[PDB]
Amino acid sequence: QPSQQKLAEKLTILNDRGVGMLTRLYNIKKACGDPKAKPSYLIDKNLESAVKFIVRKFPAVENQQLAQLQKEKSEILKNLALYYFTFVDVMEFKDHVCELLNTIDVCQVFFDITVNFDLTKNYLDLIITYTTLMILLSRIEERKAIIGLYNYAHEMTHGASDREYPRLGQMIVDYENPLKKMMEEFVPHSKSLSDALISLQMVYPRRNLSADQWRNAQLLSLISAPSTMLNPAQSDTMPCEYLSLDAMEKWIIFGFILCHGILNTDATALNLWKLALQSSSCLSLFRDEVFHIHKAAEDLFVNIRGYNKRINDIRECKEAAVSHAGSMHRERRKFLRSALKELATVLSD
Amino acid sequence: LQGTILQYVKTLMEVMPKICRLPRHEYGSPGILEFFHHQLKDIVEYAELKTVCFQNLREVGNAILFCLLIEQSLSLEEVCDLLHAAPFQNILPRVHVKEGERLDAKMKRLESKYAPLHLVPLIERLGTPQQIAIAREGDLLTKERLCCGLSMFEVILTRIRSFLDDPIWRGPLPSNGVMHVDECVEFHRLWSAMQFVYCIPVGTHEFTVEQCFGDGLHWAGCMIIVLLGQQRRFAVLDFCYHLLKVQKHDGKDEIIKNVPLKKMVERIRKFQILNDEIITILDKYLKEHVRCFQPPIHQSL
Amino acid sequence: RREIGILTTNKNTSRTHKIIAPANLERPVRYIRKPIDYTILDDIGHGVKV
Amino acid sequence: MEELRAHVRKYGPVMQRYYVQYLSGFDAVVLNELVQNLSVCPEDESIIMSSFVNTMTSLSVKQVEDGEVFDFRGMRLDWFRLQAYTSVSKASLGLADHRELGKMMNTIIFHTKMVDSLVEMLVETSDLSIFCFYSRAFEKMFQQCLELPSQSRYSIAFPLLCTHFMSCTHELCPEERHHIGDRSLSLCNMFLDEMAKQARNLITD
Amino acid sequence: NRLVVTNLDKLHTALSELCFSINYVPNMVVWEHTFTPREYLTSHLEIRFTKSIVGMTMYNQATQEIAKPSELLTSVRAYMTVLQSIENYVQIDITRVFNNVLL
Ligand SMILES: [Cl-]
């Protein structure tokens, strides 16, 4: 039953859903990071003792400690329900993603960015959206307190815990170090993910060149070959020509972490990962929330046995990024100003 | 334009190099400077370029400047006339409204105050049919000025464009069906050669082009380009602008054929600024379907 | 005036406000939770039903 | 970037015209030549691919001239669907054995976007709503632009960027939309006021 | 020589460069609101012209000093000449700001 799996539909719908979830979670993290925007129950000096109890005992649900919490139970359920059920929607999203990724494994899917562009891109987007969403969640320090308070207020109102709490409390704990959990979770996904990412070698490297190489190719010049001005600008990989370099870089960096096994076995995959590691010092999780690549990658790899060769790669790539990436990007911007100016002007004429 | 300038444009377009490509960045700014020197040698050495060609252009520029500036003076003269006409023509400025008052309430009340000054109504009340008719005609002449809704500079420019009907301003149809690039068959390209000449630094005790001709020279040269619709192609294809672009990138400084490159590109920037101001002004005052192209077609149909 | 009139054209200059708000301000929409639905694209193109 | 975006918005019809012809008069021929050379493929796949050809041939420049609103969401999702059908293992029509089909189809999909998706394409390739979340840097870049005469020429880029801000919102978080909206209006107003004040100051001098 | 840069050169260049931006687009639409850049300039020029005129009168109650009318008029005329030139750069009716301020 492979033609009734509805991959195109499921990938489209889940990718859109995840962006929405990232947006909601982003706003929880910002509000909870700001003491003037935080929910009052986390600031209040009186309730801090009741909060400390819940956090320490999380996820186990169960007194003089919940004395202040007792009278404010209805207001806690009222004001924390928005945040709580956002966390619930993050979990349900995760369950849907995991199911789709398992289905794809079973279907043994051929992935090539230069061939099935939409299938490959969606597959990679979803994995990265999933990954960045779990990392973002891990940065919401007050998430246990929030989920706990809502549930503890729920059990002293309706008798028992919330329907989703047991499974939600588990996800929070299981993904507390999100990339470590995800690296082991993606072992069975590793074959198809590495296939899709390796296909990126036909695009990313040639899209990641220097200003000097852009001048040699006279990139974006309409007038370098005057007799071709009528001829259509085309290639056999059209959507690949303008696909964001920023998006690809995240695919490569996180993706190869998730199928780390291939970094020891495949030089093509290793060299691709390193090219990406040499190009930035941080990535965008979502908007202005950034992920510092080399520190986080080292932390993960120092705690695994068979990858104590990879620490050298990370650090060598880190120095190259700090030393050369800035200037390489600076030269690109100089080139692009000239190229876009000339392009705009010819097109207006 | 149709006489001596046309004559020298036709002459210099032939002396001009048939084809002139903008050399790639990699050659370096010094080499690009050397390239332009050689390629444009005959424009550089043309004995009457300043005495005749720049001179006649400066005169065109000064003429077009006179029109712009005289229109502006006229506008200043008219606006002052109208301000003094205002009290006899019922025209009142906006008045300050304190709380508890209306804008319409006081403006009507102030109109009452200055009603004895309203000229035409007063004569219509107390004057003879001859007096009334003269005042009515006088009032129409006083209120209806050019500054009210009319301008002239656009008409001046539109009419100068029709003086450029000779085929050597625009040249032959482009080989590629789009635009000329390497070919030097359009006026803007000759202007680029002329710009090369006037950007060359001279001795510390020699007079410069700006000392000799002032801005009028550039107003004329830029006016021709704009009216021919050549300003975008000039911006892209200009020799000096290209040299400046490459020098900015590589930051090299050599004395090529007695032209110190740094000094040369500094001057180019100054004229680039001036040209852009002039072109922008001309375009502003000179306030549809485009040429479309065919996608590839299969032998099938 | 007739003689100078030959050299004139209308100047296309008009006055307006710095900011013009739209006739209808955008209505604020309340957030309602709804589950993941895999059928919302079935009517787009050649869809397939469960 | 704003100039390129403005060209696309102003001369949209030019691009639509070019690509409706490309779709109807070339793409449809080569896609037909390729589909007819397939020896074996299931009915579901064959229905989809013939619909591509049917859709493309039934287009004409007249539709552009008349100002019709094109919709190719169906065609694009069907190619996506077809990718899924032909990429699973033991598929009767295997895309890995027909690479040239996918490359041709990706080109064709780009062509459909040049007809109906020019507004969306500008968002995809050039949205800078990100500045909404780097407001300090946004304002600082503006000031730096204004204080440098050769760059102040381009200062209008900042108010123009304020039009992007709404593109950062999602239907699942309407709570933030008005806040971002009000931020875009406040910044646009401030930029335009500051540009005017500087011109005022230079004129006074 | 154009390499010798006067204060007036600097001011003139900076003015023309910025007016290119102010005049670049007639209006823009941000979240369904329409913004008209030139109208910010018009408004500020009205207010500034008013401000400068009263300023150049050099009036002081305490010392009983005020500008000679001829000198004020000379300065007002110079201002008007410069302000008139703005029409070279921006699609604005300076005549109507003159009207507004002076009347
Ligand atoms: Cl914000």
Swiss-Prot record, chain B:
Subcellular location(s) of the protein: Cytoplasm; Cytoplasm, Perinuclear region; Cell projection, Lamellipodium; Cell projection, Ruffle
Residue window of the full protein shown: 941 to 1250 of 1253
Comment field (misc): Breakpoint hotspot for the Prader-Willi/Angelman syndromes and may be implicated in autism. Commonly altered in tumors.
Gene behind this protein: CYFIP1
Subunit note: Component of the WAVE1 complex composed of ABI2, CYFIP1 or CYFIP2, BRK1, NCKAP1 and WASF1/WAVE1. Within the complex, a heterodimer containing NCKAP1 and CYFIP1 interacts with a heterotrimer formed by WAVE1, ABI2 and BRK1. Component of the CYFIP1-EIF4E-FMR1 complex which is composed of CYFIP, EIF4E and FMR1. Interacts with FMR1 but does not bind to related proteins FXR1 or FXR2. Interaction with EIF4E stimulates FMR1 binding. Component of the WAVE2 complex composed of ABI1, CYFIP1/SRA1, NCKAP1/NAP1 (NCKAP1l/HEM1 in hematopoietic cells) and WASF2/WAVE2.
Protein's UniProt name: Cytoplasmic FMR1-interacting protein 1
Bilayer-spanning residue ranges: none
Function, in words: Component of the CYFIP1-EIF4E-FMR1 complex which binds to the mRNA cap and mediates translational repression. In the CYFIP1-EIF4E-FMR1 complex this subunit is an adapter between EIF4E and FMR1. Promotes the translation repression activity of FMR1 in brain probably by mediating its association with EIF4E and mRNA. Regulates formation of membrane ruffles and lamellipodia. Plays a role in axon outgrowth. Binds to F-actin but not to RNA. Part of the WAVE complex that regulates actin filament reorganization via its interaction with the Arp2/3 complex.
Family, similarity comment: Belongs to the CYFIP family.
UniProtKB/Swiss-Prot annotation, chain C:
Posttranslational modification: Phosphorylated by ABL1.
Tissue-level expression: Widely expressed. Abundant in testes, ovary, thymus, and colon, with lower but detectable levels in prostate, peripheral blood leukocytes, and spleen.
UniProt-annotated location(s): Cytoplasm; Nucleus
Quaternary state and interactors: Component of the WAVE complex composed of ABI2, CYFIP1 or CYFIP2, BRK1, NCKAP1 and WASF1/WAVE1. Within the complex, a heterodimer containing NCKAP1 and CYFIP1 interacts with a heterotrimer formed by WAVE1, ABI2 and BRK1. CYFIP2 binds to activated RAC1 which causes the complex to dissociate, releasing activated WASF1. Interacts (via SH3 domain) with ABL1 and ABL2. (Microbial infection) Interacts with human cytomegalovirus UL135.
Domain notes: The SH3 domain is critical for binding to ABL1 and ABL2.
Disease: There is evidence, including phenotypic data from ABI2-knockout mice, that loss-of-function variants in ABI2 may play a role in autosomal recessive intellectual disability.
Function noted in UniProt: Regulator of actin cytoskeleton dynamics underlying cell motility and adhesion. Functions as a component of the WAVE complex, which activates actin nucleating machinery Arp2/3 to drive lamellipodia formation. Acts as a regulator and substrate of nonreceptor tyrosine kinases ABL1 and ABL2 involved in processes linked to cell growth and differentiation. Positively regulates ABL1-mediated phosphorylation of ENAH, which is required for proper polymerization of nucleated actin filaments at the leading edge. Contributes to the regulation of actin assembly at the tips of neuron projections.
Family named by the database record: Belongs to the ABI family.
Name this polypeptide is given: Abl interactor 2
Biological source species: Homo sapiens
Lineage: Eukaryota, Metazoa, Chordata, Craniata, Vertebrata
Region of the whole protein represented: 106 to 161 of 513
From Swiss-Prot, chain E:
Organism: Homo sapiens (Human)
Function recorded in the entry: Part of the WAVE complex that regulates lamellipodia formation. The WAVE complex regulates actin filament reorganization via its interaction with the Arp2/3 complex. Actin remodeling activity is regulated by RAC1. As component of the WAVE1 complex, required for BDNF-NTRK2 endocytic trafficking and signaling from early endosomes.
Coiled-coil regions, chain positions: none
Name of the protein in question: Nck-associated protein 1
Range of the intact protein held here: 668 to 770 of 1128
Entry's localization field: Cell membrane; Cell projection, Lamellipodium membrane
Top-rank lineage group of the source organism: Eukaryota
Gene transcribed to yield this protein: NCKAP1
Organism placement in taxonomy: Eukaryota, Metazoa, Chordata, Craniata, Vertebrata
Quaternary structure annotation from Swiss-Prot or TrEMBL: Component of the WAVE1 complex composed of ABI2, CYFIP1 or CYFIP2, BRK1, NCKAP1 and WASF1/WAVE1. Within the complex, a heterodimer containing NCKAP1 and CYFIP1 interacts with a heterotrimer formed by WAVE1, ABI2 and BRK1. Component of the WAVE2 complex composed of ABI1, CYFIP1/SRA1, NCKAP1/NAP1 and WASF2/WAVE2. CYFIP2 binds to activated RAC1 which causes the complex to dissociate, releasing activated WASF1. The complex can also be activated by NCK1. Associates preferentially with the first SH3 domain of NCK. Interacts with NYAP1, NYAP2 and MYO16. Interacts with TMEM132D. (Microbial infection) Interacts with human cytomegalovirus protein UL135.
Family the UniProt entry places it in: Belongs to the HEM-1/HEM-2 family.
Tissues with expression: Expressed in all tissues examined except peripheral blood leukocytes, with highest expression in brain, heart, and skeletal muscle. Expressed in cells of various brain regions including Purkinje cells and dentate nucleus of the cerebellum, CA4 region and dentate gyrus of the hippocampus, and in frontal gray and white matter.
